[PDB]
């Protein structure tokens, strides 16, 4: 009915989107540089506070992993207990949101003009050099292509 | 393996996220004011031209409706032909991304404060007020709770 039902207040600005896992919880990142996960009723599971502000949207894969980059230029993979998997230390800000393929490969842009292709264990696959920022956040097609924009005026499409 | 397909120039950064429609049609925004539609081969299929920036990521509908936020204030829904179906105006920017509802609701957020719920027709259905704009892209939960962060630093749970 567009009624309030609860508002969670973190430390700073919330312009991470939410990311709805398998059980309910909401996962979203916020300007104070923590990764929230709150649970369905508005109170805190956990929190994982990076090195800067997170910006990026999280993922989360099949197996309950939460994706989510942060100005620290790392892309953070988090276990469901809020305990870290591994992190991947790009070159710039990493304000793109993580998308997962077919394979479980992990795409992502970052300020260095790189797209990241990571791989589950988290792995270096291959990274792509645009020729500006890559703020957009990739998307991948049926036949696994991926497509994501750049500050260099291109829209990319890149194979698997 | 990381190769390039082709890239799409665009007249200005691309900061918007690729949309992939049904049909294999690939929707972003660009920094020029114009949210593009092009074949998987990358030729052009249509642009359509807005009155500012379109940073917001496009979402497609059911029946194929593409809907984006531009600069100009708009939240715009365009026929999968390039044609406009209509174009909500609010307050401000409209760089949130839209979310589709289970019944076809249509929300996205907007630099004037306001959390937006339209209806497929293209009228309000109801604006929820935060502290600050909003700019995180909404998520719609299991029993269609809309989720939202904001620049007042909270995190939102509203109900459909």
């Known amino acids: ?6 508002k969670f207040e973190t430390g700073g ?16 990142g ?15 599971k956990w929190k994982f506070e990076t090195g800067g502000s997170v ?12 994706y989510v980059g942060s100005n620290d230029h790392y892309l953070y993979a988090i ?26 490969t992990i795409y992502v ?9 990571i791989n589950p264990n988290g792995k270096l696959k291959w990274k792509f050099e645009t020729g500006g920022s890559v703020h957009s956040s990739p998307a991948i097609g049926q036949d696994g292509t991926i497509y994501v924009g750049s500050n260099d005026h291109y829209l ?3 194979n698997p």
Do not use: C, M, R
């Open 55 to 66: 910006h990026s949207s999280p993922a989360i894969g099949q197996d309950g992993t939460i």
């Open 13 to 28: 600005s919330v312009h991470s989107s939410p990311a709805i896992g398998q059980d309910g919880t909401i996962y979203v």
């Open 79 to 104: 276990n469901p207990n809020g305990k870290l998997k591994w992190k991947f230390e790009t070159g710039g800000s990493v304000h793109s949101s993580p998308a997962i393929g077919q394979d479980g």
């Open 1 to 6: 009915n567009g009624k309030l039902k609860w």
């Open 30 to 44: 916020s300007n104070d540089h923590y990764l929230y996960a709150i649970n369905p009723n508005g109170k805190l």
């Open 109 to 117: 842009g970052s300020n260095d003009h790189y797209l990241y292709a």
């Open 156 to 158: 990319y499409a890149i």
